[PDB]
Amino acid sequence: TQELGNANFENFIGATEGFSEIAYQFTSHILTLGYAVMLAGLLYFILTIKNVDKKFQMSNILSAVVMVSAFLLLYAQAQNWTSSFTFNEEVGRYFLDPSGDLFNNGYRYLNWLIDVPMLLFQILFVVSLTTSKFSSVRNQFWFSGAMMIITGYIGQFYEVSNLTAFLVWGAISSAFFFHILWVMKKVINEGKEGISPAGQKILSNIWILFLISWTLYPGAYLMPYLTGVDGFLYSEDGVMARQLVYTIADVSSKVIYGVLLGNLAITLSKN
Ligand SMILES: *C/C=C(C)/C=C/C=C(C)/C=C/C1=C(C)CCCC1(C)C
């Protein structure tokens, strides 16, 4: 039995095969880029709040708060990665360090728990609904989004120990994800009514961005099993891939999403 690498697939690899210098350093630098971009975004959203009418500024405020939480928690995740493995001169690879704290997904999942409700909420300060009620949409978003992250978090505890449960819990989580997609699509359709064609075009881009960037997360969750129980991805390569797809998803769903909403708000105050 491999006691030290039971908690997650990153630990499992690091306690059996170990990581190449390339995989270790690559992952270290990708995660560093992750939190560095959130700090830049924090400054962008603060400095541009004066460019939008007061009625839309709650969206820029919620983007700045998402940036603070993501900078701090991705910074923690980055330090956790680099401090958890150490180099063995004999084998020439990085292995899980029993004296360290071991790699822990808690930082990222906590970041999601906080940010998902705010990302979904903030669009309701830019578009107008038509036949739907603000409170009803808000409550559906907050409930479904919380459940999606919780059931997902439960799933990842069984990643190494019980793949069957890993997949069943991820399927449950996917149910909530599809309900979010259904609600967001109705919101975008109602928000397109009555606004200018320029604004409708930006909203269409927001919808495509939202759909792709959020679908990246379940992809990264499954990444090391996407080539079978002993394929190319069941390895340090599935780890590099998973961590890269999370970082791309985070920049897109938090920073780029917020920039587009700010551009929509500016467009709206032109008619
Ligand atoms: C800024 C962080 C964001 C927007 C996080 C989004 C997270 C998700 C869409 C997570 C989705 C999941 C599934 C649909 C199934 C597998 C488990 C999750 C939690 C990764």
- The answer to whether 109 and 152 have CB atoms below 8 angstroms apart is yes
Q: How far is CA 265 from CA 48, 119, 251, in A?
A: 12, 15, 20
Closest C-alpha to 13, from 248, 233, 245:
233
What is the rounded CA–CA span in Å between residue 103 and residue 116? 23
> Is ligand 1 within 6 A of the CB of residue 242?
no
> Is ligand 1 within 6 A of the CB of residue 116?
yes
In this structure, which residue's CA is closest to atom 13 in ligand 1?
218
What is the rounded CA–CA span in Å between residue 35 and residue 9? 22
- Tell me the one-letter amino acid at 263: N
Closest C-alpha to 40, from 254, 261, 209:
254
248-251, long-range: CB < 8 A, 24+ apart: 248/216, 249/213, 249/214, 249/216, 249/217, 249/220, 250/34, 250/38, 250/70, 250/74, 251/34, 251/37
What is the rounded CA–CA span in Å between residue 254 and residue 67? 8
Q: Which two tokens stand for residue 169?
A: 């819990």
> Is ligand 1 within 6 A of the CB of residue 223?
no
Residue range(s) defining the domain that contains residue 163: 1-271
Q: What are phi and psi of 191, to 5 degrees?
A: -70, -25
Atom of ligand 1 nearest to the CA of 115: 1
DSSP 253: I
Q: In the PDB record, what is the listed experimental method?
A: X-ray
Q: Per DSSP, what are the bridge partners of residue 95? A: 86
Helix (H, G, I), strand (E, B) or coil at 62: helix
- The answer to whether 169 and 155 have CB atoms below 8 angstroms apart is yes
Residue 221 CA to ligand 1 center (angstroms) comes to 8
Chain breaks in the chain (C to N over 2.5 A) after: none
Which residue, chain included where needed, has tokens 């560093």?
32
Report the 3 state secondary structure along 197-234.
HHHHHHHHHHHHHHHHHHHHHHHHHHHHHCCCCCCCCC
Closest C-alpha to 15, from 102, 106, 107:
102
In this structure, which residue's CA is closest to atom 5 in ligand 1?
112
Q: Give the burial string for 88-119 (b: 16+ CB within 10 Å, else e).
A: eeeeebbbbbeeeebbbbebbebbbbbbbbbb
Indicate the angle between helix axes 197-222 and 236-250, nearest 10 degrees: 160
Residue 88 CA to ligand 1 center (angstroms) comes to 35
CATH code of the domain covering residue 196: 1.20.1070.10
Residue 71 CA to ligand 1 center (angstroms) comes to 18
Helix (H) or strand (E) holding 264: helix 257-268
Q: Which residues contact 30 (CB under 8 A, 6 or more apart)?
A: 240, 243, 244, 247
Q: Which two tokens stand for residue 138?
A: 């808000």
Closest C-alpha to 28, from 101, 89, 91, 103:
103
Question: In the chain, how many H helices and how many E strands?
Answer: 9, 2
Closest C-alpha to 40, from 64, 57, 73:
64
Atom of ligand 1 nearest to the CA of 180: 9
Helix (H) or strand (E) holding 88: strand 85-88
Mutate to test the pocket of ligand 1, among 35, 144, 163, 173 (most ligand atoms within 8 A of CB): 173
Distance of CA 208 to the CA centre of its chain: 16
Atom of ligand 1 nearest to the CA of 149: 19
Q: Per DSSP, what are the bridge partners of residue 6? A: none
Q: Which residues contact 69 (CB under 8 A, 6 or more apart)?
A: 111, 114, 115
Burial class (CB in 10 A: 0-12, 13-18, 19+), 178: exposed
In this structure, which residue's CA is closest to atom 17 in ligand 1?
152
> Is ligand 1 within 6 A of the CB of residue 170?
yes
- The answer to whether 61 and 49 have CB atoms below 8 angstroms apart is yes
> Is ligand 1 within 6 A of the CB of residue 18?
no
Number of domains in the chain: 1
Cα dihedral sign, 82-215-112-59: positive
- The answer to whether 269 and 71 have CB atoms below 8 angstroms apart is no
Q: What are phi and psi of 22, to 5 degrees?
A: -65, -50
